[PDB]
Amino acid sequence: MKQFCKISVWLQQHDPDLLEIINNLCMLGNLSAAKYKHGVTFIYPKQAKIRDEIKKHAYSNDPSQAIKTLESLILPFYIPTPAEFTGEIGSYTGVKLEVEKTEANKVILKNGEAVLVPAADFKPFPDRRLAVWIMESGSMPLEGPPYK
Amino acid sequence: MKQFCKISVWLQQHDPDLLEIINNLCMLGNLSAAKYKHGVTFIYPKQAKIRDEIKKHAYSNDPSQAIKTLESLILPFYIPTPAEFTGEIGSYTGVKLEVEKTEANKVILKNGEAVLVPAADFKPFPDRRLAVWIMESGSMPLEGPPYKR
Amino acid sequence: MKQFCKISVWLQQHDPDLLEIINNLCMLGNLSAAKYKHGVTFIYPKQAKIRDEIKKHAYSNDPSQAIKTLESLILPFYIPTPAEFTGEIGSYTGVKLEVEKTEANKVILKNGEAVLVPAADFKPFPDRRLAVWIMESGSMPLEGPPYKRKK
């Protein structure tokens, strides 16, 4: 597929292992559109270290930290471009995201220096309020003041 | 499986590739029973020509024509026999279907000359309002006056 | 997976064919948590004899007997230990389950002498009201007096 009505379809092509972890943690709903949900923005960790730690925790006898990391990577907002990375937005952790620097096709966040670039091959269908960014380096915030 | 509580289970046995496209185009709901739905009737294109065109469009940079075709093949009505192929019915394109020709076990539609025969191997559960027809030739209406809702 | 947020993940690891049948018979909801549902307790038949019989019926032209057997194996209650195998409980057949005897880690039921031991490798996520027992021998009651269901 080259156009996407669901983020899972893109993830099934880009990292089916991570999609299986998300399904195995009963988190597919976090990733999915819902009527009263502003949107979904998924932050895909480029660097294998973040993903390997998710996998190791996910398949352990306490997958609690894999769940919280995945919550920090999923925003119940539709944020397609650098312009929309403002205001009271954040992940399924309540933590508010703050922009440090913006470029034409890149955002850098405070509180972890997450370097985020839109996934070049993620194009939603025209209704769909879905976005995928690649986190090239840094970490998404785990703790901090909540957005409200 | 030989009696079916879901059309997807029948389709998985005949053309799993097509079911994957339906899933990947977020159209599994169209295919599924619902409280507010008269039923579901699925029109399976027998001719590999139609399905190959669906696959090529679905995996292209614009799957709009795959979506439109799949919508034309899914009726949110329960139409088990030729007798019930009448009235204000049609697909998720909204186009009213008009029968040209009827037989005991076949309907031929106007607006594409769709030739439809009930699938010999699809029998729903007694409490499921599901039907599957096989389109032997022609095409389901894409365009036309809408049925009333 | 070593902790389970849904029973399907556990069953996929032990008998994926059986999970596919439950999906294909539109019984995943029986196996799933729901807001006003006391819980889910799944009885896995250890003996391949019982599971092969479910498989033959499920792939037949009338899978009704596969449905009934699977309904008898799924309880819309959370019963994690022998202590909770009491009261007005039973499977989706509606048949009341009655304990004959309990041990520290086993229950033996009337009406079939079902011998049930909690699955050693099933731990729910904290606060998921899910349980899996292994039926080592006997059969879960198929017919019998109904338990009193909530409204």
Domain boundaries, chain A: 7-137
Total residue length of chain B:
149
Could you tell me if B28 and B9 are in contact, meaning their C-beta atoms sit under 8 angstroms apart?
no
3-state helix, strand, coil in chain B (%, to 5): 25, 25, 50
Sheet bearing B115-118, strands edge to edge: B74-75, B40-45, B130-137, B115-118, B107-109, B99-102
Tell me which chain C residue has its CA closest to the CA of residue A60: C2
List of long-range contacts for C52-57, beta carbons under 8 Å, 24+ apart: C54/C18, C54/C21, C55/C17, C55/C18, C55/C21
Rounded to a whole number of angstroms, the distance from the CA of B49 to the nearest CA of chain C is 29
Could you tell me if B76 and B30 are in contact, meaning their C-beta atoms sit under 8 angstroms apart?
yes
Task: Return the SS3 of A143.
Answer: coil
What is the token pair recorded at B72?
A: 């034309």
Could you tell me if C118 and C105 are in contact, meaning their C-beta atoms sit under 8 angstroms apart?
yes
Q: What are phi and psi of A83, to 5 degrees?
A: -60, -35
Provide CB contacts within 8 A for C50, sequence distance 6+: C69, C135, C139
Distance CA B81, CA B117 (A): 9
Chains that touch A (3 or more CB pairs under 8 A): B, C
Could you tell me if B142 and B95 are in contact, meaning their C-beta atoms sit under 8 angstroms apart?
yes
Contact A1 B62 (CB under 8 A): no
- Chain A residues touching residue C3 (CB < 8 angstroms): 61-63
Could you tell me if B1 and C58 are in contact, meaning their C-beta atoms sit under 8 angstroms apart?
yes
Provide CB contacts within 8 A for A23, sequence distance 6+: none
Contact A2 B26 (CB under 8 A): no
Chains that touch B (3 or more CB pairs under 8 A): A, C
User: For residue C96, what is the DSSP state?
Assistant: B
Distance CA B37, CA A13 (A): 33
Could you tell me if B103 and B117 are in contact, meaning their C-beta atoms sit under 8 angstroms apart?
no
Distance CA C49, CA C139 (A): 11
Q: What are phi and psi of C71, to 5 degrees?
A: -60, -40
Dump the DSSP string for A36-82: T---EEEEEE-SHHHHHHHHHHHTSS-THHHHHHHHHTEESS---SG
Q: Return the CATH superfamily for domain C7-137.
A: FAS1 domain (2.30.180.10)
Could you tell me if B99 and B114 are in contact, meaning their C-beta atoms sit under 8 angstroms apart?
no
- Chain B residues touching residue A9 (CB < 8 angstroms): 24
Distance CA C125, CA C106 (A): 22
Rounded to a whole number of angstroms, the distance from the CA of A108 to the nearest CA of chain C is 34
Distance CA C45, CA C56 (A): 15
Distance CA A112, CA A118 (A): 18
State how beta strands C74-75 and C99-103 pair. Answer: unpaired
Resolution of the deposited coordinates, in angstroms? 1.9
Tell me the one-letter amino acid at B51: R
Total residue length of chain C:
151
Q: Which one, of C14, C17, C75, lies nearest residue C42 by Cα?
A: C75
Distance CA B95, CA A142 (A): 51
Distance CA A100, CA A82 (A): 11
User: For residue C124, what is the DSSP state?
Assistant: B
Distance CA A120, CA A134 (A): 9
Could you tell me if C119 and C44 are in contact, meaning their C-beta atoms sit under 8 angstroms apart?
yes
Nearest by CB to A26, from C2, C5, C123: name it: C5
Task: Return the SS3 of C46.
Answer: coil
Task: Return the SS3 of B41.
Answer: strand
- Chain A residues touching residue B24 (CB < 8 angstroms): 1, 5-6, 9
Contact C63 B1 (CB under 8 A): yes
Could you tell me if A68 and A128 are in contact, meaning their C-beta atoms sit under 8 angstroms apart?
no
Distance CA C11, CA C14 (A): 5
Q: Which one, of A86, A90, A77, A83, lies nearest residue A129 by Cα?
A: A77
Task: Return the SS3 of C126.
Answer: coil
What is the token pair recorded at A25?
A: 């943690």
Q: From which experimental method does this structure derive? A: X-ray
Cα pseudo-dihedral B136, B141, B142, B144, rounded to 10: 170
Neighbours of C65 (CB within 10 A): 15
What is the token pair recorded at A49?
A: 């270290």
What is the token pair recorded at A138?
A: 């840094």
Distance CA C138, CA A116 (A): 58
Distance CA B6, CA A141 (A): 43
First to last CA, chain C: 36
